[PDB]
Amino acid sequence: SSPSVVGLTSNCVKPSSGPVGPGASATGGYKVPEYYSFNRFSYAEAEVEMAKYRCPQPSALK
Amino acid sequence: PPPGTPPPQTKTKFGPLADEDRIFTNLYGRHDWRLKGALKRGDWYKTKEIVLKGADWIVNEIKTSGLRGRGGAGFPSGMKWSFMNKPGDGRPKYLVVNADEGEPGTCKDREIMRHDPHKLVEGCLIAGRAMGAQAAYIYIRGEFYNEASNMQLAIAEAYQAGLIGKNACGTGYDFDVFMHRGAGAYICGEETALIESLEGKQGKPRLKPPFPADVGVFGCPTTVTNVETVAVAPTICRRGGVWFASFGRTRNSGTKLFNISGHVNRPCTVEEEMSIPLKELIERHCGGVTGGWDNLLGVIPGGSSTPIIPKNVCDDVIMDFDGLIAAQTSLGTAAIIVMDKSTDVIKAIARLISFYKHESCGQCTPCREGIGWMNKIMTRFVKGDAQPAEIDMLWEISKQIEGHTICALGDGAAWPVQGLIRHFRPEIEKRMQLHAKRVSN
Amino acid sequence: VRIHIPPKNAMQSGTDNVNTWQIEFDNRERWENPLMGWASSGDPLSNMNVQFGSPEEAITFCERNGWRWYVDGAAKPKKERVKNYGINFAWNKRTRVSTK
Amino acid sequence: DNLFVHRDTPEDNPNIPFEFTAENKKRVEAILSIYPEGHKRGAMIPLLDLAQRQYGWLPISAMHKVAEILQLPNMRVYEVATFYTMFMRKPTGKYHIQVCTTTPCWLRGSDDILETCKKQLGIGVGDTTKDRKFTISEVECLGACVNAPMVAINDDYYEDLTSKDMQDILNDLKADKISPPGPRNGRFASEPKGEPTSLSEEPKGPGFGLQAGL
Amino acid sequence: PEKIEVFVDDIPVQVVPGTTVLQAAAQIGVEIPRFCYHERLAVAGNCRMCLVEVEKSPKPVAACAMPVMKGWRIKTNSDLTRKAREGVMEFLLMNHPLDCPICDQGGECDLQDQAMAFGSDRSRFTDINYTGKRAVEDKDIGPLVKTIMTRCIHCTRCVRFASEIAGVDDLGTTGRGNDMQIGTYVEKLFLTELSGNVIDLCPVGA
Ligand SMILES: Cc1cc2nc3c(=O)[nH]c(=O)nc-3n(C[C@H](O)[C@H](O)[C@H](O)COP(=O)(O)O)c2cc1C
Ligand code: SF4
Ligand code: SF4
Ligand code: SF4
Ligand code: FES
Ligand code: FES
Ligand code: NA
């Protein structure tokens, strides 16, 4: 698959552990386990992944 | 008709908002928020084709939509997105999406980022081409950590599907989206203050002019736009600007999110047609005030920075920009804060004044320490330890802070006290009068 | 006699106290007072000060009374200064401020 | 009691050593590569935030390290680190209980939650415990106003709390056992409690009601 | 370029485009009050003392920073402008520490002179008897410059100078709201050959 999620290091459950949080589940009424299943360094870890897809970028230099 | 001419409204009732007309179809997170889930909702549909129409075509749709900014100022978006379209410079161009959600009583921006992040990323692209921006930054609260990661997850999906990055959506247009987790500061939701934080400075609002369209992040043209404005940007293009203009009154088109918090039976967030009568709103989704409509004491139409309105005015208010201005109050962020009769209104307002005192950046003189004065005044009102003549003084101080500050936070902090004194002054006097008896006796 | 404009107070921004030309005499001797230590002087004109509208009048007044005079160079009108605000936030220029 | 002036302390002095871990160091390079070439001091807030997550709180020795990364005067970091509120410049411990107290969380009984938190832990507002495990601290508005009253614990949002269900959390956390976050009152997220009213009908799907002009 | 026409108190003036309202009124000879603006420092709009009315505009515009636009009718000595200045003085003088007898700046103080010329005569700050004024800790900047930070009005002249003219970048702003303070976070020496000039920029006795 091309659209792969952020590396499982940045997802706490890795990837399913039954219902989590207030009832959020993969097939439950509230289908968003990701929101309740992030590492404490999830946001920062994700940044290392996206460096590949982000193109070059401007420069104010002289 | 010129491109900037939304069709005149021709309806006399604005209450239903049929389900198919809802924009954010995944507001309550009942479906898959992933790319497969959103694709089944058509979020990334025909995005190539919209982009290749041309920036000028996209803007004229937006002016035809008559979409006014949801951020809280309400300045018409059409013009706002046209100032940055002027081709005058050879510097880069950025689109800063303001995902900050600082204003009390407002949760709407949190919804758009947990369960439809791809709608926001989608909207960045369409808005990106309209401004011709080389990249977009998403500024998110520090406290919204999980949402940021959730938003980050959606962005990574977009990159792998080829929707953004090099050859975004196969249009030949190069676009990169970035996230910037600002630390906790309510002031950072102000356009220029936001631009300063992204530059890494302290984060104090700048003066205008120069406006962001000339100098913005890193001194380059930028357009600071709220998430709801962006998230609706693509669905306007898909479903036509005229369709959106159908809803809302003549100069107040569009659907709006209403976070109805406070003493209500069933507080929640609900998309509803703007210009709906307020009574029809509270008793349609939220199950009415706790003690029935008779226990209502007044509401704050737009969260803090909105003058309160008493019960009698609420009988006939219209939840709309023009409609509320008639009631000496502003819609703001559309967040309603209902207040039962069993509520110390003085203590409720005094909290908000204390809130602003904690959030003033301190840069400019009135709000730096003029608010520090009202905070001291309002504290003594709560105890009733004040002379009745102080009421007019407190009215007087507010007039001095309004319009003399750099940003609109100062203007915000003055509206609550003016709404309080203008409607519940008799109650304030009674509290003082009791304080005289108990202390004297 | 020294025709001059009184010097602006560096410790203030107001200026309407330097909108005149003046005459002040030479700064003759002073000495400690033997008894109490006050400042003493035998210089009546040292106390003196008069105001004028232009040096030409000031010279005219000085000539009519026989005083010897010399004029301090009139401060040239300050060159125009741009003082733009937007340049504080510049993309590639050094004028960008690191503070706020 | 927070001060905006740094005084030498055993817990917080510049001679303390602090360094980004090899894991975190690779993240710094990713962060710095996000702002234009000449304007990299915009990474200061990400870096300062990334510093305290590795440390719990933000020492001064960390502040210098960020400045060394960006090659700036040391004070330009101090201004930024002192402006924003979640940079804890004094030790915080492990759990930093974030209790909203502004309207409308105040309207829906927030004072009770604050009172019970102090009683259960026997500390004052804006203060830490002896073990540096809990640090109760009021906050202003966490943007969860709809699901009020609510508390946040270091990243999380425990919404729709009361006296009973809150002490359940503290009893769990004091037992070192993780607890479920999210709303407690049988509502998944920001939905009107009970039967739904909107969005019950299926999403229409792609292509509905298009302009037909592309 | 071509001189733009602007009227200050209904007196026409010619100014090159880009000129600030404060500079434009200087040509007539009108001196708008100022605290944060200094002629040799970067423009900031902190003090808001320079506020001035403009015909047909929603609100006062900071004279120091507003670039003149053609056709305007600036109104320095109008009722709206006078009220604005009175408001800010009433605001600046809340927390000033009541030190003029023991303050070196006395008799040379901008906050004094501009209070007389523009500010009101009374004080409405009833809260002296309940919660008192603000008081800020002092700073040890060195052997040359004494520092009494409770008198600071946060004009940021000192900060702008040290960053722009001396180029030391050791002074700055910390905190927010009323608890904002100017000074080094960690005690240091403001060591520069030009250090003295700060003593002249600070319009108050801080
Ligand atoms: C003190 C203050 C805080 C603000 N916070 C926000 C915010 O959190 N989210 C937002 O969208 N606009 C906020 N605004 C409004 C912005 O200044 C601006 O109007 C808006 O972001 C522009 O986008 P819009 O067209 O959707 O309104 C704030 C303004 C002020 C003065
Ligand atoms: S009004 Fe308040 S927040 Fe806005 S610039 Fe002035 S001091 Fe800062
Ligand atoms: S700085 Fe303050 S205390 Fe000193 S002379 Fe001026 S007004 Fe008085
Ligand atoms: S110390 Fe003096 S110069 Fe610096 S901000 Fe305060 S009043 Fe202005
Ligand atoms: S008032 Fe508590 S989350 Fe907003
Ligand atoms: S002189 Fe203009 S705001 Fe200070
Ligand atoms: Na001084």
PDB file of C-alpha atoms in Angstrom, chain E:
ATOM      1  CA  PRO E   1       8.858  61.287  -5.466  1.00  0.00           C
ATOM      2  CA  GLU E   2       5.954  63.736  -5.602  1.00  0.00           C
ATOM      3  CA  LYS E   3       4.958  65.431  -2.366  1.00  0.00           C
ATOM      4  CA  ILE E   4       1.673  64.193  -0.952  1.00  0.00           C
ATOM      5  CA  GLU E   5      -0.790  66.697   0.504  1.00  0.00           C
ATOM      6  CA  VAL E   6      -2.014  66.223   4.068  1.00  0.00           C
ATOM      7  CA  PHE E   7      -3.662  68.607   6.518  1.00  0.00           C
ATOM      8  CA  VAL E   8      -2.752  68.578  10.209  1.00  0.00           C
ATOM      9  CA  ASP E   9      -5.230  70.683  12.175  1.00  0.00           C
ATOM     10  CA  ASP E  10      -6.520  71.918   8.798  1.00  0.00           C
ATOM     11  CA  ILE E  11      -3.118  73.344   7.770  1.00  0.00           C
ATOM     12  CA  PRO E  12      -1.921  71.859   4.448  1.00  0.00           C
ATOM     13  CA  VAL E  13       1.472  70.157   4.395  1.00  0.00           C
ATOM     14  CA  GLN E  14       3.691  68.551   1.765  1.00  0.00           C
ATOM     15  CA  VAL E  15       5.367  65.281   2.742  1.00  0.00           C
ATOM     16  CA  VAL E  16       7.184  62.627   0.757  1.00  0.00           C
ATOM     17  CA  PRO E  17       5.037  59.467   0.620  1.00  0.00           C
ATOM     18  CA  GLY E  18       5.800  57.106   3.476  1.00  0.00           C
ATOM     19  CA  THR E  19       6.219  59.872   6.051  1.00  0.00           C
ATOM     20  CA  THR E  20       4.696  59.106   9.420  1.00  0.00           C
ATOM     21  CA  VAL E  21       1.962  61.264  10.897  1.00  0.00           C
ATOM     22  CA  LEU E  22       4.289  62.210  13.736  1.00  0.00           C
ATOM     23  CA  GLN E  23       6.930  63.450  11.314  1.00  0.00           C
ATOM     24  CA  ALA E  24       4.351  65.232   9.172  1.00  0.00           C
ATOM     25  CA  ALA E  25       3.095  67.201  12.164  1.00  0.00           C
ATOM     26  CA  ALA E  26       6.692  68.028  13.082  1.00  0.00           C
ATOM     27  CA  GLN E  27       7.025  70.165   9.956  1.00  0.00           C
ATOM     28  CA  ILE E  28       4.190  72.424  11.094  1.00  0.00           C
ATOM     29  CA  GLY E  29       5.819  72.585  14.519  1.00  0.00           C
ATOM     30  CA  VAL E  30       3.354  70.328  16.352  1.00  0.00           C
ATOM     31  CA  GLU E  31       4.918  67.904  18.835  1.00  0.00           C
ATOM     32  CA  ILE E  32       2.633  64.947  19.544  1.00  0.00           C
ATOM     33  CA  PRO E  33       3.393  63.334  22.925  1.00  0.00           C
ATOM     34  CA  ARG E  34       5.452  60.168  22.808  1.00  0.00           C
ATOM     35  CA  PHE E  35       7.048  57.637  25.089  1.00  0.00           C
ATOM     36  CA  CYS E  36       8.143  54.677  22.977  1.00  0.00           C
ATOM     37  CA  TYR E  37       9.000  56.447  19.736  1.00  0.00           C
ATOM     38  CA  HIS E  38      12.579  57.635  19.518  1.00  0.00           C
ATOM     39  CA  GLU E  39      14.024  59.227  16.434  1.00  0.00           C
ATOM     40  CA  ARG E  40      17.085  56.960  16.298  1.00  0.00           C
ATOM     41  CA  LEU E  41      15.484  53.647  17.301  1.00  0.00           C
ATOM     42  CA  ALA E  42      13.252  51.220  15.459  1.00  0.00           C
ATOM     43  CA  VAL E  43       9.587  52.152  15.519  1.00  0.00           C
ATOM     44  CA  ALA E  44       7.407  50.416  18.089  1.00  0.00           C
ATOM     45  CA  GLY E  45       3.842  51.118  19.125  1.00  0.00           C
ATOM     46  CA  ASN E  46       3.881  50.104  22.768  1.00  0.00           C
ATOM     47  CA  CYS E  47       3.016  53.281  24.632  1.00  0.00           C
ATOM     48  CA  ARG E  48      -0.008  54.369  22.563  1.00  0.00           C
ATOM     49  CA  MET E  49       0.516  57.900  23.852  1.00  0.00           C
ATOM     50  CA  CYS E  50       0.938  59.219  20.313  1.00  0.00           C
ATOM     51  CA  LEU E  51      -2.638  58.326  19.398  1.00  0.00           C
ATOM     52  CA  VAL E  52      -4.289  60.920  17.188  1.00  0.00           C
ATOM     53  CA  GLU E  53      -7.642  61.361  15.489  1.00  0.00           C
ATOM     54  CA  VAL E  54      -8.075  61.145  11.723  1.00  0.00           C
ATOM     55  CA  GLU E  55     -11.157  62.468   9.959  1.00  0.00           C
ATOM     56  CA  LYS E  56     -13.497  59.637   8.962  1.00  0.00           C
ATOM     57  CA  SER E  57     -11.669  56.723  10.536  1.00  0.00           C
ATOM     58  CA  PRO E  58     -13.001  54.045  12.905  1.00  0.00           C
ATOM     59  CA  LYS E  59     -10.439  54.616  15.659  1.00  0.00           C
ATOM     60  CA  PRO E  60      -7.339  56.595  16.630  1.00  0.00           C
ATOM     61  CA  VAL E  61      -4.155  55.752  14.746  1.00  0.00           C
ATOM     62  CA  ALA E  62      -0.719  55.669  16.334  1.00  0.00           C
ATOM     63  CA  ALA E  63       1.029  58.730  14.959  1.00  0.00           C
ATOM     64  CA  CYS E  64       4.511  57.271  15.375  1.00  0.00           C
ATOM     65  CA  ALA E  65       3.820  54.306  13.094  1.00  0.00           C
ATOM     66  CA  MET E  66       1.033  55.388  10.739  1.00  0.00           C
ATOM     67  CA  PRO E  67       2.391  56.282   7.275  1.00  0.00           C
ATOM     68  CA  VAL E  68       0.594  59.348   5.964  1.00  0.00           C
ATOM     69  CA  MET E  69      -1.979  58.808   3.220  1.00  0.00           C
ATOM     70  CA  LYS E  70      -3.049  61.532   0.826  1.00  0.00           C
ATOM     71  CA  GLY E  71      -5.996  63.738   1.701  1.00  0.00           C
ATOM     72  CA  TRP E  72      -6.114  62.991   5.428  1.00  0.00           C
ATOM     73  CA  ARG E  73      -7.185  65.620   7.951  1.00  0.00           C
ATOM     74  CA  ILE E  74      -5.212  64.843  11.101  1.00  0.00           C
ATOM     75  CA  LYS E  75      -6.686  66.376  14.268  1.00  0.00           C
ATOM     76  CA  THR E  76      -4.091  66.749  17.009  1.00  0.00           C
ATOM     77  CA  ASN E  77      -5.954  69.145  19.311  1.00  0.00           C
ATOM     78  CA  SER E  78      -9.460  67.714  19.121  1.00  0.00           C
ATOM     79  CA  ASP E  79     -11.722  66.408  21.851  1.00  0.00           C
ATOM     80  CA  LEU E  80     -11.228  62.789  20.809  1.00  0.00           C
ATOM     81  CA  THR E  81      -7.445  63.147  20.761  1.00  0.00           C
ATOM     82  CA  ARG E  82      -7.429  64.852  24.155  1.00  0.00           C
ATOM     83  CA  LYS E  83      -9.525  62.098  25.719  1.00  0.00           C
ATOM     84  CA  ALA E  84      -7.211  59.439  24.300  1.00  0.00           C
ATOM     85  CA  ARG E  85      -4.125  61.005  25.863  1.00  0.00           C
ATOM     86  CA  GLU E  86      -5.886  61.486  29.193  1.00  0.00           C
ATOM     87  CA  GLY E  87      -6.853  57.826  29.193  1.00  0.00           C
ATOM     88  CA  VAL E  88      -3.314  56.589  28.674  1.00  0.00           C
ATOM     89  CA  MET E  89      -1.867  58.895  31.331  1.00  0.00           C
ATOM     90  CA  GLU E  90      -4.537  57.683  33.732  1.00  0.00           C
ATOM     91  CA  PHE E  91      -3.347  54.223  32.707  1.00  0.00           C
ATOM     92  CA  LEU E  92       0.410  54.781  32.836  1.00  0.00           C
ATOM     93  CA  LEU E  93       0.212  56.401  36.272  1.00  0.00           C
ATOM     94  CA  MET E  94      -1.625  53.603  38.090  1.00  0.00           C
ATOM     95  CA  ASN E  95       1.409  51.541  39.023  1.00  0.00           C
ATOM     96  CA  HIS E  96       4.128  54.165  38.912  1.00  0.00           C
ATOM     97  CA  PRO E  97       5.618  53.882  42.396  1.00  0.00           C
ATOM     98  CA  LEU E  98       5.066  57.411  43.772  1.00  0.00           C
ATOM     99  CA  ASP E  99       8.780  58.147  44.062  1.00  0.00           C
ATOM    100  CA  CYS E 100       9.292  61.601  42.540  1.00  0.00           C
ATOM    101  CA  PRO E 101      10.947  63.072  45.673  1.00  0.00           C
ATOM    102  CA  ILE E 102      13.599  60.309  45.661  1.00  0.00           C
ATOM    103  CA  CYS E 103      13.763  59.727  41.895  1.00  0.00           C
ATOM    104  CA  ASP E 104      16.720  61.143  39.995  1.00  0.00           C
ATOM    105  CA  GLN E 105      14.579  61.947  36.965  1.00  0.00           C
ATOM    106  CA  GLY E 106      12.441  64.376  38.958  1.00  0.00           C
ATOM    107  CA  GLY E 107      12.253  67.744  37.273  1.00  0.00           C
ATOM    108  CA  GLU E 108      13.532  66.074  34.096  1.00  0.00           C
ATOM    109  CA  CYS E 109      10.965  63.310  33.690  1.00  0.00           C
ATOM    110  CA  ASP E 110       8.928  62.793  30.548  1.00  0.00           C
ATOM    111  CA  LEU E 111       6.213  61.031  32.520  1.00  0.00           C
ATOM    112  CA  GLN E 112       5.932  64.134  34.702  1.00  0.00           C
ATOM    113  CA  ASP E 113       6.027  66.746  31.960  1.00  0.00           C
ATOM    114  CA  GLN E 114       3.595  64.930  29.692  1.00  0.00           C
ATOM    115  CA  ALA E 115       1.290  64.260  32.636  1.00  0.00           C
ATOM    116  CA  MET E 116       0.988  68.004  33.240  1.00  0.00           C
ATOM    117  CA  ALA E 117       0.599  68.947  29.596  1.00  0.00           C
ATOM    118  CA  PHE E 118      -1.934  66.293  28.580  1.00  0.00           C
ATOM    119  CA  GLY E 119      -2.953  64.010  31.427  1.00  0.00           C
ATOM    120  CA  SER E 120      -5.812  64.603  33.810  1.00  0.00           C
ATOM    121  CA  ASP E 121      -5.405  66.201  37.218  1.00  0.00           C
ATOM    122  CA  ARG E 122      -7.343  63.721  39.372  1.00  0.00           C
ATOM    123  CA  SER E 123      -6.695  60.066  40.117  1.00  0.00           C
ATOM    124  CA  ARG E 124      -9.518  57.547  39.878  1.00  0.00           C
ATOM    125  CA  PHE E 125      -7.398  54.670  41.218  1.00  0.00           C
ATOM    126  CA  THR E 126      -9.569  53.926  44.230  1.00  0.00           C
ATOM    127  CA  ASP E 127      -7.892  50.532  44.647  1.00  0.00           C
ATOM    128  CA  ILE E 128      -4.868  51.951  46.467  1.00  0.00           C
ATOM    129  CA  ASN E 129      -6.670  51.141  49.715  1.00  0.00           C
ATOM    130  CA  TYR E 130      -7.528  47.503  48.897  1.00  0.00           C
ATOM    131  CA  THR E 131      -4.887  45.722  46.787  1.00  0.00           C
ATOM    132  CA  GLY E 132      -2.237  48.388  46.319  1.00  0.00           C
ATOM    133  CA  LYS E 133      -0.095  49.085  43.304  1.00  0.00           C
ATOM    134  CA  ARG E 134       2.416  46.816  41.580  1.00  0.00           C
ATOM    135  CA  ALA E 135       5.989  46.386  42.773  1.00  0.00           C
ATOM    136  CA  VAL E 136       8.763  44.727  40.783  1.00  0.00           C
ATOM    137  CA  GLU E 137      12.074  43.316  41.977  1.00  0.00           C
ATOM    138  CA  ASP E 138      15.260  45.249  41.212  1.00  0.00           C
ATOM    139  CA  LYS E 139      18.052  44.177  38.870  1.00  0.00           C
ATOM    140  CA  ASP E 140      21.837  44.283  39.272  1.00  0.00           C
ATOM    141  CA  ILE E 141      22.993  45.477  35.861  1.00  0.00           C
ATOM    142  CA  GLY E 142      26.409  46.807  36.857  1.00  0.00           C
ATOM    143  CA  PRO E 143      28.471  49.567  38.445  1.00  0.00           C
ATOM    144  CA  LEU E 144      27.415  52.293  36.001  1.00  0.00           C
ATOM    145  CA  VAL E 145      23.620  51.980  35.793  1.00  0.00           C
ATOM    146  CA  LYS E 146      21.426  51.935  38.867  1.00  0.00           C
ATOM    147  CA  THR E 147      18.174  50.072  38.295  1.00  0.00           C
ATOM    148  CA  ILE E 148      14.799  50.596  39.977  1.00  0.00           C
ATOM    149  CA  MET E 149      12.496  48.547  37.781  1.00  0.00           C
ATOM    150  CA  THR E 150       9.300  49.459  39.602  1.00  0.00           C
ATOM    151  CA  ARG E 151       9.310  52.783  37.727  1.00  0.00           C
ATOM    152  CA  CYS E 152       9.602  51.206  34.282  1.00  0.00           C
ATOM    153  CA  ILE E 153       6.811  52.018  31.847  1.00  0.00           C
ATOM    154  CA  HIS E 154       7.825  49.229  29.458  1.00  0.00           C
ATOM    155  CA  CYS E 155       8.574  51.610  26.621  1.00  0.00           C
ATOM    156  CA  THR E 156      11.274  49.210  25.375  1.00  0.00           C
ATOM    157  CA  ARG E 157      13.608  52.041  24.421  1.00  0.00           C
ATOM    158  CA  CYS E 158      16.348  50.322  26.407  1.00  0.00           C
ATOM    159  CA  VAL E 159      15.728  46.971  24.750  1.00  0.00           C
ATOM    160  CA  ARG E 160      15.640  48.405  21.243  1.00  0.00           C
ATOM    161  CA  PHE E 161      18.810  50.424  21.780  1.00  0.00           C
ATOM    162  CA  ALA E 162      20.865  47.588  23.240  1.00  0.00           C
ATOM    163  CA  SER E 163      19.755  45.335  20.396  1.00  0.00           C
ATOM    164  CA  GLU E 164      20.135  47.849  17.555  1.00  0.00           C
ATOM    165  CA  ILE E 165      22.765  50.459  18.439  1.00  0.00           C
ATOM    166  CA  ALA E 166      25.050  48.682  20.897  1.00  0.00           C
ATOM    167  CA  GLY E 167      24.241  45.284  19.407  1.00  0.00           C
ATOM    168  CA  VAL E 168      24.760  43.397  22.661  1.00  0.00           C
ATOM    169  CA  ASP E 169      21.425  41.516  22.840  1.00  0.00           C
ATOM    170  CA  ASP E 170      21.720  40.915  26.582  1.00  0.00           C
ATOM    171  CA  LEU E 171      18.651  42.933  27.630  1.00  0.00           C
ATOM    172  CA  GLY E 172      15.106  41.915  26.873  1.00  0.00           C
ATOM    173  CA  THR E 173      11.526  41.364  27.942  1.00  0.00           C
ATOM    174  CA  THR E 174      10.330  38.477  30.104  1.00  0.00           C
ATOM    175  CA  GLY E 175       6.862  37.524  31.244  1.00  0.00           C
ATOM    176  CA  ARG E 176       3.513  38.795  30.065  1.00  0.00           C
ATOM    177  CA  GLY E 177       0.652  40.870  31.313  1.00  0.00           C
ATOM    178  CA  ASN E 178       1.303  43.062  34.318  1.00  0.00           C
ATOM    179  CA  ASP E 179       4.060  40.706  35.443  1.00  0.00           C
ATOM    180  CA  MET E 180       6.117  41.635  32.382  1.00  0.00           C
ATOM    181  CA  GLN E 181       9.615  42.795  33.253  1.00  0.00           C
ATOM    182  CA  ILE E 182      12.575  44.198  31.349  1.00  0.00           C
ATOM    183  CA  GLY E 183      16.009  42.909  32.257  1.00  0.00           C
ATOM    184  CA  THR E 184      18.399  40.002  32.067  1.00  0.00           C
ATOM    185  CA  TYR E 185      16.846  36.724  33.153  1.00  0.00           C
ATOM    186  CA  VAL E 186      20.090  35.718  34.879  1.00  0.00           C
ATOM    187  CA  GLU E 187      22.051  38.423  36.656  1.00  0.00           C
ATOM    188  CA  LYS E 188      24.742  39.763  34.344  1.00  0.00           C
ATOM    189  CA  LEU E 189      26.707  42.918  33.609  1.00  0.00           C
ATOM    190  CA  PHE E 190      25.499  45.134  30.767  1.00  0.00           C
ATOM    191  CA  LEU E 191      29.064  45.712  29.614  1.00  0.00           C
ATOM    192  CA  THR E 192      29.433  48.020  26.641  1.00  0.00           C
ATOM    193  CA  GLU E 193      31.308  51.229  25.954  1.00  0.00           C
ATOM    194  CA  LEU E 194      27.934  52.732  24.980  1.00  0.00           C
ATOM    195  CA  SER E 195      26.187  51.469  28.129  1.00  0.00           C
ATOM    196  CA  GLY E 196      25.752  54.998  29.446  1.00  0.00           C
ATOM    197  CA  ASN E 197      23.405  56.058  26.657  1.00  0.00           C
ATOM    198  CA  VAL E 198      20.691  53.817  28.090  1.00  0.00           C
ATOM    199  CA  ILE E 199      20.473  56.210  31.030  1.00  0.00           C
ATOM    200  CA  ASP E 200      19.345  58.949  28.643  1.00  0.00           C
ATOM    201  CA  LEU E 201      16.864  56.863  26.658  1.00  0.00           C
ATOM    202  CA  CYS E 202      14.815  55.617  29.598  1.00  0.00           C
ATOM    203  CA  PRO E 203      12.235  58.422  29.870  1.00  0.00           C
ATOM    204  CA  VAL E 204      11.475  57.470  33.479  1.00  0.00           C
ATOM    205  CA  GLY E 205      13.799  56.905  36.398  1.00  0.00           C
ATOM    206  CA  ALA E 206      14.016  53.137  36.048  1.00  0.00           C
TER     207      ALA E 206
END
